[PDB]
Design a protein around this ligand. Sequence first.
Ligand SMILES: Cc1cc2c(cc1C)C(=O)CC1(CCN(C(=O)c3cc(C)c4[nH]ncc4c3)CC1)O2
Ligand SMILES: Cc1cc2c(cc1C)C(=O)CC1(CCN(C(=O)c3cc(C)c4[nH]ncc4c3)CC1)O2
Lengths: 695, 695
Amino acid sequence: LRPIATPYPVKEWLQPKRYKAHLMGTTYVYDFPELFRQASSSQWKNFSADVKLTDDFFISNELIEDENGELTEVEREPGANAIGMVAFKITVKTPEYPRGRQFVVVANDITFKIGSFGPQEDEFFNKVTEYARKRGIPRIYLAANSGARIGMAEEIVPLFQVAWNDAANPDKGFQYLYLTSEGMETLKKFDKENSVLTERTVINGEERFVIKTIIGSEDGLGVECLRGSGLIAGATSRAYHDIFTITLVTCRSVGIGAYLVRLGQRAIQVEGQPIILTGASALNKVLGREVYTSNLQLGGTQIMYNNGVSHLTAVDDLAGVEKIVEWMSYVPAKRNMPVPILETKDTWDRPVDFTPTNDETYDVRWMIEGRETESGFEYGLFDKGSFFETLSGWAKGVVVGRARLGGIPLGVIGVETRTVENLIPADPANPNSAETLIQQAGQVWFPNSAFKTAQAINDFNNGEQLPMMILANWRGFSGGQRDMFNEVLKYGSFIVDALVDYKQPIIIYIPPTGELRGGSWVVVDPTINADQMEMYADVNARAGVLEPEGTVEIKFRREKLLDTMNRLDDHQQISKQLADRERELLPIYGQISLQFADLHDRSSRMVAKGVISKELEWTEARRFFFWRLRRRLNEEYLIKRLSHQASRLEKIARIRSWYPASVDHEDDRQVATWIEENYKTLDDKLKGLKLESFA
Amino acid sequence: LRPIATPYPVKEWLQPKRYKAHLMGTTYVYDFPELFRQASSSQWKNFSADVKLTDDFFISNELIEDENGELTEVEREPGANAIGMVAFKITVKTPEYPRGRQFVVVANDITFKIGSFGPQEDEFFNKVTEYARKRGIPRIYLAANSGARIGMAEEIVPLFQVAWNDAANPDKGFQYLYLTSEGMETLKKFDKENSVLTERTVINGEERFVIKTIIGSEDGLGVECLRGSGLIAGATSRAYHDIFTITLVTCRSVGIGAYLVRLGQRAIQVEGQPIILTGASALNKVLGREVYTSNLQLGGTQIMYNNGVSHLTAVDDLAGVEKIVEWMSYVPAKRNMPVPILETKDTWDRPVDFTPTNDETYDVRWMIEGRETESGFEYGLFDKGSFFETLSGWAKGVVVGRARLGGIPLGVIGVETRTVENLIPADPANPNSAETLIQQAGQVWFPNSAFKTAQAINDFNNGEQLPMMILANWRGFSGGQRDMFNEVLKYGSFIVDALVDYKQPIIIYIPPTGELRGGSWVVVDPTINADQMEMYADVNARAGVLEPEGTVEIKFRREKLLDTMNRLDDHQQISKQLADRERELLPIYGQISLQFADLHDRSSRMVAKGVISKELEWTEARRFFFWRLRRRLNEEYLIKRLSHQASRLEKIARIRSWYPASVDHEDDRQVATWIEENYKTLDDKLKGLKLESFA
Ligand SMILES: Cc1cc2c(cc1C)C(=O)CC1(CCN(C(=O)c3cc(C)c4[nH]ncc4c3)CC1)O2
Ligand SMILES: Cc1cc2c(cc1C)C(=O)CC1(CCN(C(=O)c3cc(C)c4[nH]ncc4c3)CC1)O2
């Protein structure tokens, strides 16, 4: 016992495994429920400082398999785990769910065989994933592992013999490995006969049992671990389309561990904890040079956070757990439950303060969440303090995160207007490799930012089941050689596919000073998903096939400009006199044609042509969007009830035929108010529509 | 008329539009059905030279919209198209479908407003896509376009006035653009009042109508084309998951045109025909330097074929059409129809000739399709001449294509064992940029080859609805810094997702001399999709978590080697004598431990542990796989009929309970033979199982 004379018992001595976990730079697996209790308690503190919490606000029950392999809740002492994978079912009262929300936490035990995945760990991880999927509840994975378990048949190590070419000179080589009748009997004695595949041979009267295959008696040596790895890789792929999945890399995450991080998609990496496939020393053996110094060069946050594998980084385990809890606050309690409303001090009924200017550089985050100025706080479109940015280390030209609009959670995509620089590190494996600095112009979709956009759309849709707003402000895709070679078309197409799959309301809004051109409009048009998408443009937004310079270059050429010079009152001395005035007003007539082109690019044309639902004023956008979204969520709820009993067009027309004659279908507030006052009446209607018998 | 005195009429004079198409380096849209007739006729020639074809083997009917906008078949003269998009419904008798197969061909008319997409072209393209989707038939798109249609309100060009700051000095600027009562009357006269949005103002007694927005009277100027672009982008996204889609880039393909190529996924690019987003000259204006010389630098085959956007290249239009027809020969006639069997001279009942050797370099294509040697043809696993390689210009470390196994079509994925070099071109936009040569070791998955693998899996599954074989031979994923930074985890995870979605039988086979290790096994394990996947390993294959060098480094260290030195019969003079023999046999004891490790890595262990279905011998693999696949396709057909009337496990157990008691469930040939002799009897059974009434 070390140390002696502590006020309370030494937890690292009561359970030496806790001390082993700490030596390896991570939290002991049985101490993670306490971190979730601390993080959940903090959630309440930042929400309402005055609320009084008792320990019954948080329940954590360990999950273990019974005799029939069925998961059951247990209360036992830490360190009693017979396998290297542990799970907990957590029931927490949170600001969004004051009566309680549940989730499962699965975690490797880094103290159990270096957190390696053997067949029993794979089977348990899969059972826990299926448990969460069946219930529709989130699955949190805490990664601290060494990949698939490796081993040899240890019982064959002291028994095997080698059939030397020349018994006197071992350096001359050998023909095969074999067992004697003695070794074969040792195996028969311990019932390990099936540990080897032998072919009986007689050499100089002596009977040699040639080793054809080593199988081993212990399960968890090779390919059986690899099979279990594929099982959990497939299970995690499926879990991502079904429930909310998130991973915290709390110590190293190796091989299958690294794949699980990516397959669950949502990943928080603790600083200094690597996500790797093969370790640096093994890579050095294969390369035949000391190419890499550490595993952090291969899978540290400067790799994984910068390339988007890690959505966030955390300074320590508790910071990571806090980020999970915060991410979950935007997510429904379980699959197909409504998005969790959380009204705060910042109410819907207010104008939007921060306004972007054409002559001044702005951070898109100010438009989203507002900004602190010397004269006070300028409110953004969304609730003050509600913006939770993710994938912040990668493709910084697009800004993605979760926010709240009068308490309604949603995914947000914004465009960074400032030039973005990213540094490609020098490849240690190549001597002719130096670090590259890539500059990417603002408001242009590049391969990485097009990929980030599609990824964001998919992550809001799957598991999170959130509505979304895209503050659409792109000039187009980068059509240059390097970006075309780097497959910008592939990544741009992923955006389209992501939108086609979207199951919650989407609002596309070209903001003030914003633009949507040829290539960028295509990929975000509401006809891609008419059931879910709506487009709006600010009164101060622009949209056209080309920018005005482009339209002029193609459709307002020299001849047209010269015919227009016949607005200005003005053979050899005349030809030089015409060319004198023609060179004089060409700069101003260029501005005239540019302005003529720009007059087609307005929200009024967009309205007249029926390509946008409405033109809006930025200051009034929060009030407008709050009721449009609230009304859309209410109607979406009614369409789904109708479905559990026809095209969408027929469904919504039937629901709207139930609205009183006096209700204006175009008034969002009135429609939302009527539905919410009549949910139980509409239920009676839906239940009566059970006069359903159709062949 | 030029030229005069030709034996037959001058088609380019009868229809001047045909001549315009030729001047632009492409086939005239109304001449493409003739190319399909030529290509289909050639298909018959290469199949059975002796078959006599009459013109009724091929029917092509143009599709146009009626008064109600419904598509109808017409017989009219070329060039009568009132829109820049044309379509044909083709009915062809082919070797796979001698009674006929149908498909739709949609094409831009490059002679109609430079093949630009206006709202009517977008609407027609969408209607044709829906037409094909409803019928389940393939949609071929022939790309020859200029992107979305651009324009200005031409009626406002001769009427608009400018409100100068100083009428005497135009160079001093202007305040706005306006109309006079005269211009407003001209608009009222031609019923173009709504062409402008004006605000009435009185300046020095004169009434000026300030132009607030130009709308135009002509539809197809701006954002309405962009809306139509999004519509067809979404429609093509959907078509890809539903029907067989393919594109031939026959002239330039711009903007929405470029996106349509990628969204239909399967793309054949004619040499010298660019796939671009923005043209070189427009990019030069934005960059303020003459950075690019041609559109081919941006989207030629050296960009698109090399990055995998173009699956194939073609020398001309007919070569492209031939490749479409050849690709289609592996594809069902329509959605959910069985895969088209096409038995040729190369029958199932033969051994596999070409065998890979560990000591000799081989081309994986020899294992697939066989090879010509001086002593005759060495047959591969698949039918002679049946390998149709796709995505051949990109990520050459993986070999993908379609093949036939005793006539059964399937997708094939193989591993290139030779080192692959790809040249990244120097970026013209950056002066500090030089061409890079990337070398990638064989049997290692890199980001591009992991992406190609996932893409191949998806393309065989969607539209093609093919079974698949993966000749799995990977050491793992590249875990190095550059490949980890370049997101190898993301691309590796796409493989898992692709397999989870697979709806036809899959065979994973580790071939002779082949290997599957830690990272590579995970991503291809049959537990990822148990309903469709099966794994097999050759008697001469290897599989383990690590390569033997790795297992030894972790589980057969110095101490274990020294304890093993007690197999060799041999204080200050003794310590130097022990270290003398210890340095002597360390190289051979290293080989002993490597061999001990390798003995665990065999197909016999894989069988004993239940991770593979069977161990096979390469020479007998064609006979084995033909019947396993044929039997799997028959059982898959029965499970589907049961579904249209329970888990898969319950379904297959019910179907197998119908087999006579004497049928061995494990005998593929016997099971396949029994099903095919009894299809109509099994139908009677399925129809009698209509005593189905369940709440
Ligand atoms: C800064 C940046 C912006 C870009 C691009 C890349 C970068 C690096 C792209 O590749 C796309 C683009 C290209 C210019 N865009 C046009 O509409 C356009 C078109 C024509 C015909 C033009 N003639 N003259 C000017 C002009 C402008 C907007 C879209 O914007
Ligand atoms: C040529 C190439 C091959 C590679 C890699 C990259 C390249 C470039 C990878 O990143 C993955 C790898 C890494 C070596 N592999 C092992 O199993 C492995 C493991 C340990 C612990 C080892 N100690 N000593 C040797 C050894 C070998 C196979 C998989 O194979």
